[PDB]
Amino acid sequence: MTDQAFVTLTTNDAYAKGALVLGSSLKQHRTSRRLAVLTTPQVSDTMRKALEIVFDEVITVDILDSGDSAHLTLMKRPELGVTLTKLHCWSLTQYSKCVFMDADTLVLANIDDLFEREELSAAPDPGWPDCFNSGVFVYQPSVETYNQLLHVASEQGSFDGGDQGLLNTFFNSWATTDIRKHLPFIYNLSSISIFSYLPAFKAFGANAKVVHFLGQTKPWNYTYDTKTKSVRSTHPQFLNVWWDIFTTSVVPLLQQFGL
Amino acid sequence: MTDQAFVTLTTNDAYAKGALVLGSSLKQHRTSRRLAVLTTPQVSDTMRKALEIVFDEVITVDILDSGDSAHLTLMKRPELGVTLTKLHCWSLTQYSKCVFMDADTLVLANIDDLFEREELSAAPDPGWPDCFNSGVFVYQPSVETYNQLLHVASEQGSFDGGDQGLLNTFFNSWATTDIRKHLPFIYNLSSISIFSYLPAFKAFGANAKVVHFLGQTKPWNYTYDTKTKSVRSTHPQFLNVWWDIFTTSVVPLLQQFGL
Ligand SMILES: [Cl-]
Numbered sequence A, B: 001m002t003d004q005a006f007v008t009l010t011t012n013d014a015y016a017k018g019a020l021v022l023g024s025s026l027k028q029h030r031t032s033r034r035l036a037v038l039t040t041p042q043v044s045d046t047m048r049k050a051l052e053i054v055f056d057e058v059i060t061v062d063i064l065d066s067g068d069s070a071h072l073t074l075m076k077r078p079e080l081g082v083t084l085t086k087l088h089c090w091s092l093t094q095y096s097k098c099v100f101m102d103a104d105t106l107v108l109a110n111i112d113d114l115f116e117r118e119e120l121s122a123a124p125d126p127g128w129p130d131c132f133n134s135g136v137f138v139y140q141p142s143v144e145t146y147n148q149l150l151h152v153a154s155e156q157g158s159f160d161g162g163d164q165g166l167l168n169t170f171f172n173s174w175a176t177t178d179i180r181k182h183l184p185f186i187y188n189l190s191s192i193s194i195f196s197y198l199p200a201f202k203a204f205g206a207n208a209k210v211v212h213f214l215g216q217t218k219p220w221n222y223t224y225d226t227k228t229k230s231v232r233s234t235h236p237q238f239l240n241v242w243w244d245i246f247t248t249s250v251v252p253l254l255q256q257f258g259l
Helices: A013-028 A045-054 A071-076 A078-091 A112-116 A143-155 A163-170 A198-207 A237-255 B013-028 B045-054 B071-076 B078-091 B112-116 B143-155 B163-170 B198-207 B237-255
Strands: A004-010 A034-039 A057-060 A097-101 A105-107 A121-124 A132-139 A210-212 A223-225 A230-232 B004-010 B034-039 B057-060 B097-101 B105-107 B121-124 B132-139 B210-212 B223-225 B230-232
Touching: A004 A013, A004 A078, A013 A034, A013 A045, A013 A105, A013 A237, A034 A045, A034 A078, A045 A057, A045 A237, A071 A078, A071 A143, A078 A097, A078 A143, A078 A163, A097 A112, A105 A237, A132 A163, A132 A210, A143 A163, A210 A237, A223 A237, A230 A237, B004 B013, B004 B078, B013 B034, B013 B045, B013 B105, B013 B237, B034 B045, B034 B078, B045 B057, B045 B237, B071 B078, B071 B143, B078 B097, B078 B143, B078 B163, B097 B112, B105 B237, B132 B163, B132 B210, B143 B163, B210 B237, B223 B237, B230 B237
Parallel strands: A004 A034, A004 A097, A034 A057, B004 B034, B004 B097, B034 B057
Antiparallel strands: A097 A132, A105 A210, A121 A132, A223 A230, B097 B132, B105 B210, B121 B132, B223 B230
């Protein structure tokens, strides 16, 4: 399916690692869809070159450039830089439908059945569950929607200073409309919810299709012991999946660029 | 509307205070429905007498008694005592439809529009938002459903040792079925979500219809300064509403029993 893609975003090298693990995880679970990554010029050439191998398409977005449609909004709302860059996922009109996934998510199972969903489908955010979590969503590229989102970003900004606020504001019927636009939580399982509601994780977590690494420490911020195959200093299994992919597939990939 | 009620539960004197504040809060916001409270014999006579004034119906449930239908299940699963007592809300067949509200909830606005909903309607639980939070739900009394719930309690218990696990297990299509059975989060606003996702609270919290006091410290565990009209040692406004009702309406009510 060439006109459908998973789309992610990396604005730096640290998140490129996440994006590389994510992309690898999607390939590992045999997606039949394209993989696209939005990148900024702040992503270094070696990460970019690795991204070009993992992803079918690497799209460079430079909202710091005057030529960018989001640039004026950036000047108005400089804290929305990441948001405005992410919003360019809607510019990818070479695709009819996409699943956006933040670079700090990890695919545990094939999730191509997401492409049955309509814009805007997303899992509930823990914390304020009448908002959707913007880490994973099904959307449809459209210059119009992009422009409309830009306009809301310009006019109202984001109630949380992030892309999630903006997206919830724009796609505001999510909470009260169409249960099919509630992605099951297992398609965007907040790593924090392992703690916040442990019995529920015990009951339903084995079904996790996507893990979303939230909180202060991102997976790449951990130390991974390659001998014991575990991160150190915590329910580590998801981190360990992330690190195994990173160790097995991503590092060896980045290593071949030194030659 | 005589065949519809808000129903709560108190198993002790501390929660009776909550139940009294809840009942008062419902009267304050002019419910046209009946108010029913399930009570246990562990609730003292003075609390019971106060409950008889606030609530239209005080129902005594004694699952420790052999004569109780839930009693055998209690012996099997003694940790489910509170759950099994709460499940008796389904025994209240004098009502055609009820909103169950835990005694640690607080009504901030008329919520009689809940009676438009069907069993089982409930707000998402923060933490694991594909579970509903069992603090507030619309249900329909039925001996059959009661029996079915008892049976699931007996057979499977609760994945979280509480009523929420059991109810989610029984009413398991909630996450994926019928958006109208997702009560808006503002009908069961987790006091913890004030912290967990503060920008969202800032954005949507002013619309709170029901506050659900979760976490270690219940409202009655705080110290309330009646002069400054605030609790001490925190976004205190909801606690302060709880305490104002408690101070204005509940304490004076309990005071008239000493004569
Ligand atoms: Cl629906």
